[PDB]
Amino acid sequence: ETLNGGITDMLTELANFEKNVSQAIHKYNAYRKAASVIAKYPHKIKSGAEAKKLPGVGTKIAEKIDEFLATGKLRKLEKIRQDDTSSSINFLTRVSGIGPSAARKFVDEGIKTLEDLRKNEDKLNHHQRIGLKYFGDFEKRIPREEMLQMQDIVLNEVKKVDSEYIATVCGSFRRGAESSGDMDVLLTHPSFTSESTKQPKLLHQVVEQLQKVHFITDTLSKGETKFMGVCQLPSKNDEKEYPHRRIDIRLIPKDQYYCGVLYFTGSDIFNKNMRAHALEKGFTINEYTIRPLGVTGVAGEPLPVDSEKDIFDYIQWKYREPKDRSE
DNA sequence: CATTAGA
DNA sequence: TCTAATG
Ligand SMILES: [Mg+2]
Ligand code: NA
Ligand code: NA
């Protein structure tokens, strides 16, 4: 956690660069298990060799370790850190809709800067076009102060359209968070569950509504179960307009809300931990259900859930408000 | 790890 | 269809 820091840090730096600049999923996958193990290790790694004893720890990495322990640096990292080619791939990648694959290609053609991207908007698809458009806004955190007004809005329209719609703003904002990165609205409807052959309109009706009023300004992607857009709060009585914010709304078979709900609310650790527990407690939990476990090794049989509670009760635990789902 | 764009 | 990019 702090004893093997630099080591794992230098480790993940390296990996990352494999997978990103180079297309070496392998090496990258290397740096990572290593980084993974050294991470667990209970003692100050003193040299390559000590490290070396580890599983995943070959001579290659063990060797970086020495150089790093000897000199507080690393050439390869000093070298990658310099390399514009590589620096470029790192950056372009920040544009929403631009993965590595494309970052490389762009770079190839010679799109390295934000401006390059500009003079060449043509080479970019819708997503990237928008991603490039709202570059500054996407990078900004969402103050809860606004998180609230946004949540407010969405809530309203949903209701206005069908009264039977249930929506929850999941994520860290759900958990208290002072700021958030984007908005995650989970959604369902009675009329839609595990069997009932869809109702695409269900997602659609709502999107349209949000748009109608001008909350949603664009679309990154809209399918029959997951809409991925951009919104903005009515820019008041001027002098102050709002930043464009990423939004996602997904449809859910009412028969799986709460789990999904549970889940998306995190946190990553709270989840896992709860998760590990349901286990002992004789269960299983995934992004959609909670299955009683059986002796033969494994088992099925989706237990019925009406609220976050049920999940709780099942594995017999103390209902933890989102506030404290911290870990 | 599953959902969408695209080509 | 496969393959990329989000989450
Ligand atoms: Mg994005
Ligand atoms: Na080893
Ligand atoms: Na990106």
Side-chain angles (χ1 to χ4, degrees):
Chain A
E1 285 174 290
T2 229
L3 62 185
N4 292 135
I7 300 289
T8 55
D9 305 306
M10 136 211 282
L11 259 46
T12 74
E13 259 225 17
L14 256 348
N16 272 332
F17 158 93
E18 291 298 337
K19 129 81 173 236
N20 295 159
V21 177
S22 22
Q23 176 182 106
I25 159 98
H26 290 325
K27 289 191 192 175
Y28 152 84
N29 232 155
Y31 279 128
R32 74 155 315 178
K33 76 333 154 197
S36 143
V37 296
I38 93 94
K40 313 205 168 140
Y41 185 79
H43 303 280
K44 255 220 159 45
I45 296 162
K46 255 44 184 297
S47 51
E50 187 178 335
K52 163 130 223 200
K53 309 178 151 314
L54 271 28
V57 195
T59 140
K60 276 135 323 74
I61 295 146
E63 166 160 0
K64 273 134 242 200
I65 304 208
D66 286 309
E67 177 179 2
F68 170 92
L69 311 20
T71 85
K73 255 264 211 138
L74 202 83
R75 157 160 166 187
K76 212 185 193 162
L77 249 51
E78 72 165 13
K79 140 152 204 169
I80 279 153
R81 202 277 125 157
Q82 268 136 232
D83 194 16
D84 95 296
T85 270
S86 152
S87 283
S88 301
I89 305 188
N90 284 144
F91 180 101
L92 256 14
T93 245
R94 288 147 60 173
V95 168
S96 189
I98 285 189
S101 162
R104 318 186 228 153
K105 156 211 149 202
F106 277 130
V107 159
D108 290 282
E109 314 174 293
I111 325 267
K112 283 171 192 166
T113 110
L114 215 153
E115 283 199 50
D116 306 351
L117 274 176
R118 305 187 165 101
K119 340 291 313 161
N120 311 250
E121 213 170 313
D122 72 298
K123 309 207 166 54
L124 329 157
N125 79 272
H126 191 61
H127 193 146
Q128 334 186 118
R129 293 217 208 113
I130 283 222
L132 142 73
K133 188 161 144 204
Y134 305 129
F135 192 87
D137 310 15
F138 285 0
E139 269 197 343
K140 306 200 207 107
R141 296 281 318 177
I142 317 186
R144 177 163 248 242
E145 348 304 300
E146 341 183 324
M147 265 302 234
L148 293 179
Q149 44 199 131
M150 279 186 264
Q151 144 159 313
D152 173 84
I153 317 195
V154 177
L155 299 187
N156 284 358
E157 305 305 298
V158 166
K159 153 147 200 153
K160 48 215 292 267
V161 31
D162 176 345
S163 156
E164 223 82 62
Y165 277 123
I166 304 196
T168 296
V169 176
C170 325
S172 26
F173 144 85
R174 175 98 162 336
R175 297 176 311 214
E178 280 278 327
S179 73
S180 323
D182 57 353
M183 140 166 282
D184 215 340
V185 195
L186 269 45
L187 196 77
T188 184
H189 189 254
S191 174
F192 169 63
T193 113
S194 287
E195 320 88 22
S196 67
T197 286
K198 312 269 205 198
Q199 217 187 0
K201 289 308 181 201
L202 278 176
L203 170 59
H204 300 201
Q205 259 170 172
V206 14
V207 177
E208 213 173 32
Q209 178 58 204
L210 282 22
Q211 245 158 331
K212 189 186 145 174
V213 325
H214 318 290
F215 180 51
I216 278 161
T217 34
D218 328 68
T219 292
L220 258 31
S221 80
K222 184 220 347 259
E224 70 209 330
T225 42
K226 172 170 162 188
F227 156 88
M228 248 155 53
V230 185
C231 50
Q232 196 204 25
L233 297 161
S235 312
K236 306 275 177 190
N237 344 191
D238 297 331
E239 288 283 8
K240 90 269 296 278
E241 170 156 300
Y242 278 102
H244 286 76
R245 272 125 188 6
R246 280 282 298 95
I247 187 175
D248 300 347
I249 303 168
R250 39 223 315 179
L251 204 32
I252 308 287
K254 157 87 187 262
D255 79 305
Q256 330 208 278
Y257 204 63
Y258 310 115
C259 287
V261 157
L262 200 13
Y263 187 63
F264 271 103
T265 311
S267 87
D268 289 350
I269 64 280
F270 166 59
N271 258 141
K272 292 184 165 183
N273 270 93
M274 168 153 59
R275 286 184 157 209
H277 181 102
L279 234 344
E280 295 333 307
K281 293 336 164 101
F283 290 119
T284 183
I285 347 270
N286 60 132
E287 36 300 37
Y288 326 115
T289 51
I290 185 199
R291 286 164 326 158
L293 237 14
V295 85
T296 100
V298 302
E301 279 20 48
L303 263 7
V305 163
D306 258 56
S307 183
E308 294 230 74
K309 170 64 159 167
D310 289 326
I311 283 168
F312 278 103
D313 290 353
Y314 273 16
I315 69 161
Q316 53 208 150
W317 230 8
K318 67 151 141 162
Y319 190 158
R320 349 209 45 234
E321 274 226 326
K323 134 199 259 295
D324 63 68
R325 315 291 205 71
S326 290
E327 65 129 26

